[PDB]
Design an enzyme around this catalytic site. Structure first.
Site, PDB file in Angstrom:
ATOM      1  N   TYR A   1      23.223 -19.272  -2.092  1.00 49.12           N
ATOM      2  CA  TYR A   1      22.641 -19.629  -0.796  1.00 49.12           C
ATOM      3  C   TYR A   1      21.434 -20.531  -1.068  1.00 49.12           C
ATOM      4  CZ  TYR A   1      21.088 -14.826  -2.110  1.00 49.12           C
ATOM      5  OH  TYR A   1      20.695 -13.699  -2.787  1.00 49.12           O
TER       6      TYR A   1
ATOM      7  N   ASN B   1       7.350 -15.624  -4.003  1.00 49.78           N
ATOM      8  CA  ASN B   1       5.885 -15.573  -4.028  1.00 49.78           C
ATOM      9  C   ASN B   1       5.521 -14.725  -5.239  1.00 49.78           C
ATOM     10  OD1 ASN B   1       5.915 -14.972  -0.453  1.00 49.78           O
ATOM     11  ND2 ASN B   1       5.664 -16.940  -1.497  1.00 49.78           N
TER      12      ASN B   1
ATOM     13  N   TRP C   1       0.808  -1.223   0.000  1.00 52.27           N
ATOM     14  CA  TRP C   1       0.000   0.000   0.000  1.00 52.27           C
ATOM     15  C   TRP C   1       0.843   1.276   0.000  1.00 52.27           C
ATOM     16  CZ3 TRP C   1       0.196   3.602   4.039  1.00 52.27           C
ATOM     17  CH2 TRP C   1       1.011   3.216   5.119  1.00 52.27           C
TER      18      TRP C   1
ATOM     19  N   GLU D   1      11.738 -16.649 -10.664  1.00 53.99           N
ATOM     20  CA  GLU D   1      12.070 -17.996 -10.140  1.00 53.99           C
ATOM     21  C   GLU D   1      11.126 -19.038 -10.755  1.00 53.99           C
ATOM     22  OE1 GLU D   1      12.345 -18.355  -5.891  1.00 53.99           O
ATOM     23  OE2 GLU D   1      13.281 -16.400  -5.564  1.00 53.99           O
TER      24      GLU D   1
ATOM     25  N   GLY E   1       9.562  -9.790  -9.200  1.00 54.19           N
ATOM     26  CA  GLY E   1       9.487 -11.243  -9.080  1.00 54.19           C
ATOM     27  C   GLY E   1       9.573 -11.734  -7.644  1.00 54.19           C
TER      28      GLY E   1
ATOM     29  N   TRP F   1      21.669 -10.672   0.559  1.00 51.11           N
ATOM     30  CA  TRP F   1      20.273 -10.856   0.975  1.00 51.11           C
ATOM     31  C   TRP F   1      20.286 -11.098   2.491  1.00 51.11           C
ATOM     32  CZ3 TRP F   1      15.921 -10.378  -1.964  1.00 51.11           C
ATOM     33  CH2 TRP F   1      14.700 -10.552  -1.253  1.00 51.11           C
TER      34      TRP F   1
HETATM   35  C1  LIG Z   1      12.116 -20.091  -0.054  1.00 46.27           C
HETATM   36  C2  LIG Z   1      13.503 -19.507   0.319  1.00 46.27           C
HETATM   37  C3  LIG Z   1      13.830 -18.265  -0.516  1.00 46.27           C
HETATM   38  N1  LIG Z   1      15.081 -17.688  -0.161  1.00 46.27           N
HETATM   39  C4  LIG Z   1      15.354 -16.559  -0.846  1.00 46.27           C
HETATM   40  C5  LIG Z   1      16.725 -15.921  -0.692  1.00 46.27           C
HETATM   41  C6  LIG Z   1      16.889 -14.622  -1.517  1.00 46.27           C
HETATM   42  N2  LIG Z   1      16.698 -14.924  -2.945  1.00 46.27           N
HETATM   43  C7  LIG Z   1      17.045 -13.866  -3.832  1.00 46.27           C
HETATM   44  N3  LIG Z   1      18.266 -13.266  -3.837  1.00 46.27           N
HETATM   45  C8  LIG Z   1      18.230 -12.348  -4.797  1.00 46.27           C
HETATM   46  N4  LIG Z   1      19.288 -11.505  -5.143  1.00 46.27           N
HETATM   47  N5  LIG Z   1      16.973 -12.361  -5.355  1.00 46.27           N
HETATM   48  N6  LIG Z   1      16.213 -13.296  -4.740  1.00 46.27           N
HETATM   49  C9  LIG Z   1      15.416 -15.604  -3.212  1.00 46.27           C
HETATM   50  C10 LIG Z   1      15.183 -16.864  -2.338  1.00 46.27           C
HETATM   51  C11 LIG Z   1      15.147 -17.483   1.253  1.00 46.27           C
HETATM   52  C12 LIG Z   1      14.180 -16.304   1.716  1.00 46.27           C
HETATM   53  C13 LIG Z   1      14.276 -16.038   3.270  1.00 46.27           C
HETATM   54  C14 LIG Z   1      13.120 -16.134   4.072  1.00 46.27           C
HETATM   55  C15 LIG Z   1      13.159 -15.890   5.451  1.00 46.27           C
HETATM   56  C16 LIG Z   1      14.352 -15.478   6.052  1.00 46.27           C
HETATM   57 CL1  LIG Z   1      14.415 -15.183   7.762  1.00 46.27          CL
HETATM   58  C17 LIG Z   1      15.515 -15.379   5.282  1.00 46.27           C
HETATM   59  C18 LIG Z   1      15.488 -15.635   3.908  1.00 46.27           C
HETATM   60  C19 LIG Z   1      14.814 -18.758   2.060  1.00 46.27           C
HETATM   61  O1  LIG Z   1      13.572 -19.269   1.702  1.00 46.27           O
END
Ligand SMILES: C[C@H]1CN(C2CCN(c3nc(N)n[nH]3)CC2)[C@@H](Cc2ccc(Cl)cc2)CO1
Ligand code: NA
EC number: 3.2.1.14
Length: 365
Positions: free
Chosen positions: A191, A79, A50, A119, A76, A337
């Site tokens: 990761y 979700n 919002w 993704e 993207g 991230w």
């Molecule tokens: C289903 C996965 C997805 N995963 C994402 C990591 C970043 N990713 C990404 N990096 C860039 N540069 N674009 N998208 C996309 C996937 C983690 C997301 C996550 C959730 C909760 C907490 Cl506490 C930490 C992390 C772990 O759950």
């Protein structure tokens, strides 16, 4: 060197000291800030919260205090409507709709470019043909950004993409050599290599394999992912090594077997602030009392356990090791991230503000 840092527009809903808004961002910490995530409506870039229009203007306003800073908007995530990218790349007309909307939207809110976070093309429902259609999308964006700079007289909009480390996603979705030409940089998501979908403990982001691992398991590590992206044609200077300020947790089958590779019964208990089984922010792990921390010798990263809970995560030392690694490979920098998962205001770890990301900034200097 680049230091590319992701902001998340749902961290504003975290409880207490963990709440994160643009006022919590240090404008000088990173070279590039990427706002996650925008969505898509009728093949056009669109907001997801919002208050996005207000947050966008605070976020890009940080360039008043650091004019060297560049900002991007990421579209993207994990979700996302399952057919939105596929239907948009399927026709030249829908790609044109998306490209034109992106230019208008990015300029309206003062973003410096677009980060693609699909993704993933070619996997998880996406048909095999999306591998080639993703290349066409990247070309269409690069062409239109180049032309718009000439008509508008502004700096050319940047184009990046967040790309997977897993070999089967890479082979199914990415014409690496073609897209690397049109992308300004490539954010390697180094990761999520192991997690509670598996029946044994494993580290979120190990640098190298364990001696015991072979076959496909021997590629579940950062070095293997970097070598695949380089060998398939990404210039080293365009490859940006992702780093996690979070860990992945497991419930152990028995508190007496705590090794890497020990039997696990499911996700670790949700954290008090991130409230999502299987993951923990650095600020949720760095503090644990009555725990035992160990390093995995072959993989150069720590884990910690307490009773039947086991977490693989990254610390200051492993971030230092991974920067030494990326420099040895001549990579373009580091990507992280995410901002709101480090100890961003010094409230937990007794290591000052942004202990993990400030380590990257200093080591890349
Ligand atoms: C289903 C996965 C997805 N995963 C994402 C990591 C970043 N990713 C990404 N990096 C860039 N540069 N674009 N998208 C996309 C996937 C983690 C997301 C996550 C959730 C909760 C907490 Cl506490 C930490 C992390 C772990 O759950
Ligand atoms: Na992956």
């Amino acid at each position: 060197a680049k230091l590319v840092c992701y902001f998340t527009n749902w961290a504003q809903y975290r409880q207490g000291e963990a709440r994160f808004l643009p006022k919590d961002l240090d404008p000088s910490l990173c070279t590039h800030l990427i706002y996650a995530f925008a969505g898509m409506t009728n093949h056009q870039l669109s907001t997801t919260e919002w208050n996005d229009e207000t947050l966008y203007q605070e976020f890009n306003g940080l360039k008043k205090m650091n004019p060297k800073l560049k900002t991007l908007l990421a579209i993207g995530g994990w979700n996302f409507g399952t057919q939105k990218f596929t239907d948009m790349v399927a026709t030249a007309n829908n790609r044109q709709t998306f490209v034109n909307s992106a230019i208008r939207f990015l300029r309206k809110y003062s973003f410096d470019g677009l980060d693609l976070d699909w993704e993933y093309p070619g996997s998880q429902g996406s048909p095999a043909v999306d591998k080639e259609r993703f290349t066409t999308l990247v070309q269409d964006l690069a062409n239109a950004f180049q032309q718009e700079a000439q008509t508008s007289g502004k700096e050319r909009l940047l184009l990046s993409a967040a790309v997977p480390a897993g070999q089967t996603y890479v082979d199914a979705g990415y014409e690496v050599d073609k897209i690397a030409q049109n992308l300004d940089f490539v954010n390697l998501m180094a990761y999520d290599f192991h997690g509670s979908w598996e029946k044994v403990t494993g580290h979120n982001s190990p640098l190298y394999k364990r001696q015991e691992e072979s076959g496909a398991a021997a590629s579940l590590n950062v070095d293997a992912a970097v070598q695949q992206w380089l060998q398939k044609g990404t210039p080293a200077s365009k490859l940006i090594l992702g780093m996690p300020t979070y860990g992945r947790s497991f419930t152990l089958a028995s508190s007496s077997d705590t090794r890497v590779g020990a039997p696990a019964t499911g996700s670790g208990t949700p954290g008090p602030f991130t409230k999502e089984g299987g993951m923990l922010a650095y600020y949720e792990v760095c503090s644990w009392k009555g725990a035992t921390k160990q390093r995995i010798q072959d993989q150069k990263v720590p884990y910690i356990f307490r009773d039947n809970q086991w977490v693989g995560f990254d610390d200051v030392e492993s971030f230092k090791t991974k920067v030494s690694y990326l420099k040895q490979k001549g990579l373009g920098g580091a990507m992280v991230w995410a901002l709101d998962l480090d100890d961003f205001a010094g409230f937990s770890c007794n290591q000052g503000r942004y202990p993990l990301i400030q380590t990257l900034r200093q080591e890349l200097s």
